[PDB]
Amino acid sequence: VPRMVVLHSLLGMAVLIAIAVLLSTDRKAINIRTVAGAFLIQVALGALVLYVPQGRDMLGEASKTISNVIAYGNNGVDFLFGGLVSEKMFEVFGGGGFVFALRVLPMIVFFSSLMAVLYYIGVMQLLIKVIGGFLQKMLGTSKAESMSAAASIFVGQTEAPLVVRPYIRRMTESELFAVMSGGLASVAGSVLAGYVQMGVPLPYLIAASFMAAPGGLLFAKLLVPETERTQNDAEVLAENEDEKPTNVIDAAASGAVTGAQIAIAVGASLLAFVALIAMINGIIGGVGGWFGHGDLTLQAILGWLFSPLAWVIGVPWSEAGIAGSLIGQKVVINEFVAYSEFVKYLKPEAAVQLSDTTKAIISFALCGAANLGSIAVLVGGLSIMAPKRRKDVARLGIKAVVAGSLSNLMSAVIAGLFTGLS
Amino acid sequence: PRMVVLHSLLGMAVLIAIAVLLSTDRKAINIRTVAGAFLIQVALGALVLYVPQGRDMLGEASKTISNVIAYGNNGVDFLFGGLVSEKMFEVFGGGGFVFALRVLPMIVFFSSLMAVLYYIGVMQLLIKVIGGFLQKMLGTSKAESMSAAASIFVGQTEAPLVVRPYIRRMTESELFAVMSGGLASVAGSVLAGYVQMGVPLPYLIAASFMAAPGGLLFAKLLVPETERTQNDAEVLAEEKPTNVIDAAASGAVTGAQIAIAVGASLLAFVALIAMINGIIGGVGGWFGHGDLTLQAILGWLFSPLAWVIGVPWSEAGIAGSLIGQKVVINEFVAYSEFVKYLKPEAAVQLSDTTKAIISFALCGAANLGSIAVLVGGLSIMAPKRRKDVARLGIKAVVAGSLSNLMSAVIAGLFTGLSGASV
Amino acid sequence: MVVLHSLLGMAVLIAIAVLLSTDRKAINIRTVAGAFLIQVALGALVLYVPQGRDMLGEASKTISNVIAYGNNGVDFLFGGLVSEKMFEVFGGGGFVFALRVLPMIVFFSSLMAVLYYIGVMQLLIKVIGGFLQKMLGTSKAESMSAAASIFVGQTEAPLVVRPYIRRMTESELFAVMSGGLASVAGSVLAGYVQMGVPLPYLIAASFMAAPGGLLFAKLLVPETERTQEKPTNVIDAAASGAVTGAQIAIAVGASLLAFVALIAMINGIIGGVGGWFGHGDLTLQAILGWLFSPLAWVIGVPWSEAGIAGSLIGQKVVINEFVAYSEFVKYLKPEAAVQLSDTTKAIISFALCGAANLGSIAVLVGGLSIMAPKRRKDVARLGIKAVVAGSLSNLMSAVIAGLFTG
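ok -> structure tokens follow
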């Protein structure tokens, strides 16, 4: 079994990289040290947090630490919404007692105000500089895209990294794509906690975030390798007067209001997406009713379509029909809807129970902002810092989603590998 | 009977006469447009109220929309969960119907749905057909013609898109027609919100298509066309929708700030009216009438206007309140106190011909608080016309109100013959 | 001879502010004097004089009845989720902050968008805030805002003088807010009455929050160096006011949910470091409350019951007065058997009154941020100062409490 698992996984890793090479603008310019490093660093962390006992003790400890934060986050939620989030909801409404708009969306606000404190203190600047510095010293990427890849971990496509603000205007084609892919390879800390309250495995989300930094650079440099010259740090003297908050109280409140609009936007989009798909299911169910079928849903159609891809990652074909739908929904719609239907299988009451090695894969394969919807979020926000580069960002929109998705898929193979071995 | 049939001609002549008396100029009112708009508005009336075929294709349309509305609830059930379940009625009884979670979330869904239909090109297709149909009958400019067809299933002062490149330089009559057509017609998004409240759906559908010729009926009757129509879009035209997924998300967030705004307007007005009645009820204590409320005042005040449009004087005392509350305060408060009479256990019960007239009259976003709604949303494009829009603000509210009253007269005429509603 | 225990206690609190001050040389002697006069004045009028307890008490009821019309709309918006069944299904849980308090902000923003339009509020700043301008050097409003805060909550007080907050001076800003954080709405006061706290006690601090709110505000700065799209229709004004009020709530609540959790997080820090050693259960509610125990004596219960009366005040400052009064009423019960004098229960009744905790800062920041966007920075810097100045006022009332129940 293990000799076949490491073979089924290595083959899975081979296919994913092969796709990037085929879609590469210049396969000859592919710096091996940078792409072999990005692939090695990514798979190295998998052996760190999912295999070796020393790291799993740390990953578990890290989960317990962050779980406290969330437990502290609810102390403000219990104050606000009162008993609408109590255990009395599961006695009265039972399963319906779990209000998604009150258990998940408010957590988006708190974490946004939490990191805003960490950014003001300088905690993030400490972690970004280290992780960012480590990448360029092991790969060969510029200072900008390296710091961006480290900043993309804690913050997805939501907030601008700002650590590359004086760089973005004049980055190379490959450098610009690395930033875009990084934001689509990872998720924000705010939406990360949102998945946790839904039922998504916390230790898996922690590993998935840090895997998105080298994985986000892997398929970024594969699709578009570096050809031009990286901008010098002494010649890029063009820093405009940046406005900053006053104290930690101002920062803590600024992050809350900023995360408030996010929570409202998420809940509004989800109210539409869940409803719109249900409407299409009525149309497909109607059209499918003429010949065949006519129970046919968009859930099932995306299943057979992404079934081959799901099998490549490590999910058995028998269960690829389910994993295919979830990965599909993530890319063509969003990761929130995909996660909403993934937690349905995690329930012990659920009829269809999957294997632990499969649930691990899907958890990593879904963790990512790589969808058709996050394109405009990038282009819309990235154009502010670079108004004369908006044409380049818009073109690499779909290309970055692929690089962002493949990053999640690559991290998912690593999951199915080491969790299949241990 | 014959008396009732005759009475409809009275109400029609009155509403037209008022517009002529308040017209900017009687001279060379274009007869072929005024009589043309009135002919179409009463043609569509008999086409969906008198002929079986119209009512057989309207009922099917009612089920079509209601299913889409039902589809929207699937997203609502996902968002709020058991707070909108049936257990609410087994617990909170009649209070189980949470207006903030039953009606307001529907506004979001339709705003996103139309944003999708506007992204596909379906909406622009129907506008060109209807607008093109108008410009042949009344021969008004292509700019305001499409702006009239757009104002039908579009609200929240998203006029622009047909008019956006034409607003910069148009006559005072074209600008007024847009304002009239905007207030005469309800928002295509909030129309579904009324359905969840208990408002008769088929009446809302008909009133929407009557508010387009009726919106132009009192538009070219108040201030006629006297300058030449310059129809050629300016070069200034420079883009948010990237994908259909983004278009859906962008529309949902757009609709989200609408529900909050509308929801706040209801918590405001209803509370203030009660406070006003707290004063008037106290002031009336000296005069020997502590039961005198703001509702009863507007009822006896607009009672003649109700009697003119086709409502029996016996029930006009109630209809006067609802029609008045729409114009004076807003259409939402009026409908909230209208569905109370639709209850089968109500002590008093209005006639079938009364329910129709009220529903058509109340079906309009033409209120005194909707002036700045137009002004603020129309000035952003052309700030040079801001003083022009606000000048004809109240005059447009009259045109918007007269249009809904006209559709109410046509209602009572063809709903006086059969056409009963549950 | 009780007077010296209070004459010492009123000087010590006034000392605290003279220590924590910006410009001592700027301090207007007349205004700081005039306020403490009214504070000690209004008290004896509702504590001793049984006539003022009825007047000022019915004023709070009548004005709260004006606002009570706001609830006619909350019940239309959320139906039964704010009915009585909530206390029958969730009980204590059932009352909900986000549906019973935050929506009331929309009413105020809509009501005082009409009043300014109809000049009714333009007059009350002229009369009431101009009467107390020739009484003392004010903003011609700021006193008016303090007066308003008496009958309204902390989330419904800055909305009163919001068109003035734009070009408001550094003083009047801290004046309005620190006097705004000290205020408690009246409905909360009624719940406290139901719990055990004497309505005659509560009514005193209700009117002591305005002069006390000015007493310590003007102690930091006066208005240093001598200085101090519109609605089309009234329907439009109400509407425009309503919607602006909504985003106030969204931003206020977003900050509250954040900070209450952040405070809660802070403890989970303090706890681990404490969990490392013997001490740590060591909630910040007590760490400050232990710093308050010395101060507790300076007012009140000389020994052998102060240390417990101080960690009650520490709770008010960190979390809220609801929890502070939740345990205080456990002392008022007959069976408590750690008996406190009628005057020792008078002190903790006033000290714990007011609702100017740490988490309350977030409300200030949010509400301004909608009302005066370029001012949120000038409020976060003077936020923790506002808890200090406010809570010093609540104590100033408790020294007048014991001094006039003895």
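Chain C has one domain: 1-406.
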